[PDB]
């Protein structure tokens, strides 16, 4: 069934599961033509496929060539997403395949379900949560690998860096969702918070700064302030 606030701890049990977000698969800039009409130019995108328990991120880069000569691209994007997720599952050993795939947008249910007909024991589920995974292209290293791609490419990351050595996956997911919510609500401010101090670095093999436990509390506190504010600046309160 649908994933919501009530069954949130299920994300961190020992049944393998993946979130799939398709927001950033088909991306365009809209511009004027010489004749004064409007046209779109596509840019590279990505499927965001995340194991919330382990932090393993399967980032399938979608190169603009996959749209050449195709119609109804927003619709095709959902089926392309489902085809790539299906290909990913088939590439994993049986004992690594997910038992559930949770899609962040309901329009992905039927495309994924049809592509996964071969896997009747994998549950395809929606969610009621408003998860901020679109903001993954606000993470600099992830954006950089997507824009530089010259061909289809899968890139593997751990979106939690080394956090699981010190915190649980519940706490790591909550940190991730807070960082991404902040980046989505006010990217510039959020990015100021994370690196305005020049002595805290991002390791070459990591995505986020090497904060101590105490600095993470400060950082997390600053992100919640941002989110509350912008919610005022937005609604005037």
């Amino acid at each position: 069934g649908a994933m919501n606030s009530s069954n949130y701890a299920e994300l961190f049990n020992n049944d393998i599961k993946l979130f799939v977000d398709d927001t950033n698969v088909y991306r365009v800039t809209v511009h004027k033509t010489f004749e004064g009409n409007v046209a779109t130019k596509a840019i590279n995108g990505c499927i965001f496929t995340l194991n919330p328990k382990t932090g393993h991120l399967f980032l399938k880069i979608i190169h603009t060539s996959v749209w050449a000569g195709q119609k109804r691209l927003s619709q095709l994007a959902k089926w392309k997403t489902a085809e790539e997720v299906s290909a990913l599952v088939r590439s994993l050993p049986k004992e690594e395949q997910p038992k559930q795939i949770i899609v962040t947008r309901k329009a992905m249910l039927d495309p994924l379900e049809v592509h996964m007909l071969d896997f009747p024991n994998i549950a395809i589920r929606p969610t009621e949560l408003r998860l901020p995974f679109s903001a993954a292209m606000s993470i600099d290293k992830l954006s950089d690998v997507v824009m530089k791609a010259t061909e289809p490419q899968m890139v593997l990351f751990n979106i939690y860096d080394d956090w699981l050595d010190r915190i649980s996956s519940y706490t790591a997911f909550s940190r991730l969702t807070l960082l991404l919510r902040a980046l989505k609500t006010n990217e510039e401010s959020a990015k100021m918070i994370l690196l305005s101090d020049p002595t805290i670095t991002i390791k070459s093999y990591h995505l986020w700064p090497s904060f101590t436990d105490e600095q993470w509390i400060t950082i997390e506190s600053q992100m919640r302030d941002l989110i509350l504010t912008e919610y005022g600046r937005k609604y005037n309160v």
């Binding site: 085809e83 049809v114 007909l117 071969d118």
Partner: peptide, 11 residues
């Protein structure tokens, strides 16, 4: 939404 209805590769 059944294998009879959907050719592999023509999903």
């Amino acid at each position: 939404k059944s294998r009879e209805a959907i050719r592999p590769g023509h999903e």
